[PDB]
Design a protein around this ligand. Structure first.
Ligand SMILES: [Zn+2]
Length: 198
């Protein structure tokens, strides 16, 4: 009955792990992952390719669910949404509800959810065995507000929780990374990593 999703990492019996493309901190980068911070820095409405690995083949009807929650304990109970300004700007792809922060592009079987008890949003894609050539699943997520959007995230850090789930939504595995949606991911990531050392 807790409406706050757990965030504990749990690679599960199928060996569910996340992978991230290797990027640098060039000021023009649209998406960059810091392994030190386990934190994704990206621009607004720009694609972030996240790798989903499973060591053992999961049961049929398995899915990957992505959901954002506030990282700070004091804001955890608060549903992460898009700010009102962006909600009404009419930029849906005709499938993503305008309030949803996290979208998926490049997947034919995306579904968007507004939980009927928790009011939390998520976006789901099916698991499918990787191709002859391919080794993992790559989903291209997009974040549709800045971290700093007033009436929205309000400068609050968020986590993206990706769970491996059966079709009914039972937990098979869980992984997470921090996300900052900002205008200059490259600089911001260099900045946060530098504060790490010095
Ligand atoms: Zn916004």
């Amino acid at each position: 009955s807790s409406s706050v999703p757990s965030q504990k990492t749990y690679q599960g019996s199928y060996g569910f792990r996340l992978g991230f493309l290797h990027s640098g901190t060039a000021k023009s980068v649209t998406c960059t992952y810091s392994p030190a911070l386990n934190k994704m820095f990206c621009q607004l409405a720009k694609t972030c390719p996240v790798q989903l690995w499973v060591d053992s083949t999961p049961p049929p009807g398995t899915r990957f669910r992505a959901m954002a929650i506030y990282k700070q304990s004091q804001h955890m109970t608060e549903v992460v949404r898009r700010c009102p300004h962006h909600e009404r700007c009419s930029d849906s792809d005709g499938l993503a509800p305008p309030q949803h922060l996290i979208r998926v592009e490049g997947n034919l079987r995306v579904e968007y959810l507004d939980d009927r008890n928790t009011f939390r949003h998520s976006v789901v894609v099916p698991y499918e065995p990787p191709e002859v050539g391919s080794d993992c699943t790559t989903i291209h997520y997009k974040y549709m507000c800045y971290s700093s959007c007033m009436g929205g995230m309000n400068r609050r850090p968020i986590l993206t929780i990706i769970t491996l789930e059966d079709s009914s939504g039972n937990l098979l595995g869980r992984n997470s990374f921090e996300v900052r949606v900002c205008a200059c991911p490259g600089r911001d990531r260099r900045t946060e990593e530098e504060n790490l050392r010095k």
